[PDB]
Design a protein around this ligand. Sequence first.
Ligand code: GDD
Ligand code: GDD
Ligand code: MG
Ligand code: MG
Ligand code: ZN
Ligand code: ZN
Ligand code: ZN
Ligand code: ZN
Ligand code: ZN
Lengths: 385, 382
Amino acid sequence: MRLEIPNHTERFGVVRLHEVQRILELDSGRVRDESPAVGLRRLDDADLRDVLEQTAIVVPTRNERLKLLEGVLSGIPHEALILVASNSSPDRFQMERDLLEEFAHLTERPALIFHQKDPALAEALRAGGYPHPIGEDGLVRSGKAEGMILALVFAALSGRRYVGFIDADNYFPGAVWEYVRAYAAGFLMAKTPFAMVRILWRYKPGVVFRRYGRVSERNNRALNQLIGGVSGFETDVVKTANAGEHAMSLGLALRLPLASGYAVEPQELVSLLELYGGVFPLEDEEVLQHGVEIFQIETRNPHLHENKGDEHIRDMLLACLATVYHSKLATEEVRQSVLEELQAAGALAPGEEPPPPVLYPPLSSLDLQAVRKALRGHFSRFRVP
Amino acid sequence: MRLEIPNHTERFGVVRLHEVQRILELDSGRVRDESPAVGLRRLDDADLRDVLEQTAIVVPTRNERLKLLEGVLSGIPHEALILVASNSSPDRFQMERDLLEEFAHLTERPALIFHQKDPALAEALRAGGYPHPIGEDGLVRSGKAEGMILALVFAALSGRRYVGFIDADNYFPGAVWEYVRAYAAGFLMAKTPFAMVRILWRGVVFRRYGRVSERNNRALNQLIGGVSGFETDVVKTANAGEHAMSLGLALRLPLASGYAVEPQELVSLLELYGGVFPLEDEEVLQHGVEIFQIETRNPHLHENKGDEHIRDMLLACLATVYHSKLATEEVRQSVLEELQAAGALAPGEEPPPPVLYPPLSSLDLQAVRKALRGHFSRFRVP
Ligand SMILES: Nc1nc2c(ncn2[C@@H]2O[C@H](COP(=O)(O)OP(=O)(O)O[C@H]3O[C@H](CO)[C@@H](O)[C@H](O)[C@@H]3O)[C@@H](O)[C@H]2O)c(=O)[nH]1
Ligand SMILES: Nc1nc2c(ncn2[C@@H]2O[C@H](COP(=O)(O)OP(=O)(O)O[C@H]3O[C@H](CO)[C@@H](O)[C@H](O)[C@@H]3O)[C@@H](O)[C@H]2O)c(=O)[nH]1
Ligand SMILES: [Mg+2]
Ligand SMILES: [Mg+2]
Ligand SMILES: [Zn+2]
Ligand SMILES: [Zn+2]
Ligand SMILES: [Zn+2]
Ligand SMILES: [Zn+2]
Ligand SMILES: [Zn+2]
């Protein structure tokens, strides 16, 4: 894989937020006597795989066609561990388990699968002193976030260094291969234990392709405005406010609180800034000397995700602007810019005070020993030989 | 890369057609010390690339969005030599030359490019003892087939062993990568110098394209059964835009003109090496031909929704069979019926015997190498 080097890179405390990098070549081949370029990076097959050998790929699903999910699976590079994080209907979940098993079996690779609403996991969490995801029903709430949270836990338990997420509503397995390799590419270019990689795909000049465009644009702005509010300079750096397909080294993943809804992606960035932007004093000694790199990689393969959702669009916007409005870094100027976008579209007339998004605190607080203690008689269930 | 094992294999003279194989895993990793076997084919990354280091990948284009073509290029595995065969308008060709030059420089890899209507090549072919694809104007005829012929000449010259084709109307570089890894996957599983790999995929739109290719496939299978004496289901890639072949094979093979290119490749295989007619080629007699058919995980999602061509595609293919020297009266009539049934005059129906260029083997490479001497500069994207 050959990417561009980011021409500029926003600095913000110890966070280093790189400008978008285009991928020029999907597959760079095998390094020998190559002539060094200063404007782009070639990443060697070998090293990409070695990185993927330490990488967990979470595939979250809630009643997604089986064909699709199989498609996605066949597309994940061999070296990565697969975790299906399911929340499907009980029937479908079984079908998913059998699907994974055929797959892991035939391709001689380890995987894990689990279900969001599994009581075993709920007590596991709670024993490890992490009761926050559980609901009135005594089970973990439905929500992609809560699924990811549990996937993070497995990632942690399985000793993988990096976690990446790939959505299962992906028609193109070849795409998935790229996104996953691009994660590994990010982590290679990184020179910090604490790295994040976010995939985007921009569309350059309708119903779906048109008016979702102008919302990510707005969403992206509100992040840049948030940064601007602090540095005292405008910036156009953030282009991945929502980035479903994103990855992070586990060391950083466990450090970040997560939000509940569509708010999840945007929050991560806000969190990073609040935590490591040098404004509030910084506790974490190992981050203060290594810093955080954030990569934004522009993929060669389009994001084609099936749907039939309109009111997901409104919400997406709403959630992003919420996380910014309620940031401890939001200057008075930003807060109002944001509130005006909201009202002037769809949310509370007078009279707006957009719900503060609700935040699970970092997993760094979950005693992993307790969890290991608590699922001993079960780990062979989640595990798919 | 992991694939299914073909669950059967038609033997026809020394030709072996494999039943379709699904790719199960796009990327099987590095086989480093690994316990092999099971009922699938696993192909090591290292072996795959060593094969691509011997592979030319031809990208034909007539007047296609540049952004599409950059895409396609970006998906070709690094090891593979890129040949852009152009027949675009004067203006565009320039832009294409630039595009490629940029890409190859930036990614440090050899490419070549030519225009189908370049006079220098027409002179070269005529020198090579091969005037056949030249039109009246004195320039090479338009049509994809003619482009491929030229690209094969470049392939032979560049001394690569294996030639793959990839159409540029392709929206997903990821798909492109899978195709080219599949071509290598094919050649790796072959136990012969003479191998061929053919890729396929599985409103009221694509219903039209379906029933016709299943009809094109059926036609080819009928060709086979009429000879063997027993019906077969095996040909599923009568049309195969994305295909590859070891070069040794390609130069032995006479090429048809229209949408006859793909079907005719199979028919000529069967006629030359099916054991019916005298087969004299000490090497093919002794090594035989393997044809693979690989079902890809990534959809063929191209730039199209037009119906005039579709009929023509059917007519083309059914003609190649009708006019085969292997067709039986039964096989002939069955074609004629479908072909009238769809679109073709009631009485006087005898679909055009397609026109075929003789094998490229019948060409002197040193002659063309002499003739292109002052010109290699402009073809090679230096
Ligand atoms: N474990 C779990 N998985 C879920 C849940 N709900 C959905 N999923 C699965 O996780 C993915 C969520 O995808 P969608 O339901 O398609 O959400 P979306 O509206 O397409 O939005 C996505 O893309 C955006 C683009 O960057 C993202 O902003 C967003 O977070 C999300 O990933 C899907 O693969 C789905 O099958 C859940 O409650 N729990
Ligand atoms: N060099 C050259 N290229 C051409 C010419 N005409 C078309 N091409 C290019 O070669 C490819 C042929 O694709 P289309 O022109 O889109 O043909 P099609 O009707 O889409 O059919 C394609 O797909 C089918 C899939 O198996 C095939 O059956 C068919 O042969 C062809 O590849 C495209 O990249 C096209 O721009 C030509 O005269 N010369
Ligand atoms: Mg989706
Ligand atoms: Mg086409
Ligand atoms: Zn810049
Ligand atoms: Zn996506
Ligand atoms: Zn069969
Ligand atoms: Zn021999
Ligand atoms: Zn195709």
